[PDB]
């Protein structure tokens with residue numbers, strides 16, 4: 022019964038400046054846990070569908086960096102302990118979205134980036150030719 | 160059957176033709192004015208209601224990163240152009 | 244006496260008009276706050292200040308109505324006047340989002356609820372609470388002492404004048420989410436269960452009472468046992 | 473014989489937690505990591521700084537909540553947020569836990585220049601996985 | 605309050621090397637070309653040789669930041685093999701595990 026009656030909505034102002042056009046957004050997430058990337062993939066893909074963004078997903082090959090350390094504090098060279106860091110990848114490839122839609126979607130999925138997961142988002146912007154290049158001065 | 164807003168006024172003052180049309184932008188912040196502005200921030204002072212309001216508060220205070228992430232946030236190289 | 248004080252103030256205001264000084268919200272709010280002493284004598288003069296604000300163009304804030312509410316809410320029979328002052332104040336404030344303009348803006352809701360309990364009007368209390376829930380008006384409730392007083396008078400009026408099926412929905416929505424109840428509201432709740440002939444809930448009220456710090460209240464345990472037996 | 477992080481067998485009377493009972497080779501197999509951040513991922517920077525901060529926070533919390541920690545800390549970093557999740561006992565009064573939470577969150581936020589939050593879970597006693 | 609006197613000497617070497625980096629870079633640029641006269645480069649040789657010995661960056665040693673061990677250090681974490689393993693084996697280094705393959 023104790024429900025709000027009216028809710029103040031954040032102010033979104035439509036500008037007079039034209040919006041940016043992104044041909045592609047390549048969201049590459051990196052993590053140590055495949056299951057965490059599976060859950061993030063599900064969240065990010067479901068978020069794109071609700072917002073009407075076209076999204077494709079694939080899994081780039083994982084990278085395992087291994088290195089060797091001495092096991093003993095002193096001598097015993099032939100006895101080593103080997104360690105590794107596993108970096109797993111998921112790539113969300115979004116297409117044909119405006120700059121305003123990219124700001125909302127990236128903010129929404131970047132704020133919800135799980136602990137231990139990094140993101141490299143490569144944005145491909147569409148631009149027209151500069152006016153000086155349209156015709157030769159010579 | 161009579162509303163309170165209908166009746167006798169005091170009539171000492173008169174209707175403002177318009178609100179002040181040109182503000183004193185460079186008015187100094189006296190201690191009396193700075194302190195009164197703190198009494199107006201205490202009337203809407205309430206504890207955080209949920210985790211979203213804590214992020215909003217940290218974002219306004221500057222503690223929390225602004226999203227989407229910009230690796231150059233807060234770093235303009237003195238407004239220098241590429242040709243410099 | 245009021246007449247002497249009311250003649251000096253009108254002289255300051257006329258002086259303020261001679262010196263080409265325009266009054267602000269705090270000018271009128273100070274008059275209403277200072278007339279609290281005179282009570283009945285200042286009731287109509289106080290309403291003359293409010294009507295002047297509207298004409299001049301100054302907008303009454305939550306404090307402007309808090310001061311008028313406190314001035315009219317003198318000990319006595321509120322039905323004669325206080326009834327139609329609060330009903331008109333809420334029709335004006337209906338569906339209005341408020342911004343902080345006066346330091347006393349965080350006292351209106353506590354004052355307005357205090358009269359709804361006195362008048363025993365539950366429809367008015369829902370309108371007062373409805374105003375608190377519109378937009379960001381919930382931030383004007385006040386400090387913790389004012390928050391607990393507001394919800395105590397609000398819930399104690401629900402248990403009294405509301406159906407028990409709705410009362411138990413507010414009991415779940417408010418406690419402990421909004422405030423922790425005083426032992427006298429646990430009692431007011433039991434008296435509501437009795438009037439509704441729903442005593443299968445008494446063992447739950449005792450379980451909740453312990454979870455709210457009322458394990459060792461004498462007035463409460465006696466109340467629970469007497470109803471049960 | 474290997475020694476690293478191995479609670480050795482006793483006479484069946486030494487209570488160990490789930491973390492203490494698992495040697496290093498079970499890390500990533502049966503037990504997770506006590507800190508999660510991006511510094512150790514391929515192509516990421518500042519692993520050295522994140523590691524020093526973690527060592528300090530573990531010592532800081534050990535001495536700030538003396539006798540109260542019932543397990544190792546879980547350190548989470550998201551963006552510039554730092555979350556410290558600790559399992560504590562129910563011996564200290566609640567007032568002292570609120571004082572220390574307010575104090576620690578404030579002091580650590582000014583020390584490392586980031587918003588720091590402390591999440592406390594209380595248990596009546598140290599959770600025992602097995603008796604070695 | 606550094607681990608030992610040897611770590612304290614490296615701290616000072618890193619501080620002095622940082623303070624003289626720009627000056628040494630500029631003088632070295634004069635010595636590292638075949639464009640300027642030898643008479644000018646011979647003077648630049650003497651100028652960089654007269655700078656404080658602890659301004660020279662080759663004297664900086666990558667010691668373990670927690671134990672000051674001068675060898676067996678992993679650059680990425682700036683820890684000795686012993687200290688790194690202690691943290692790694694207790695699951696305190698994010699994403700690091702024992703490697704079997």
Ligand SMILES: [Mg+2]
Pocket residue numbers: 100473
């Ligand atoms: Mg061996």
Ligand SMILES: [Mg+2]
Pocket residue numbers: 662664665
């Ligand atoms: Mg060397």
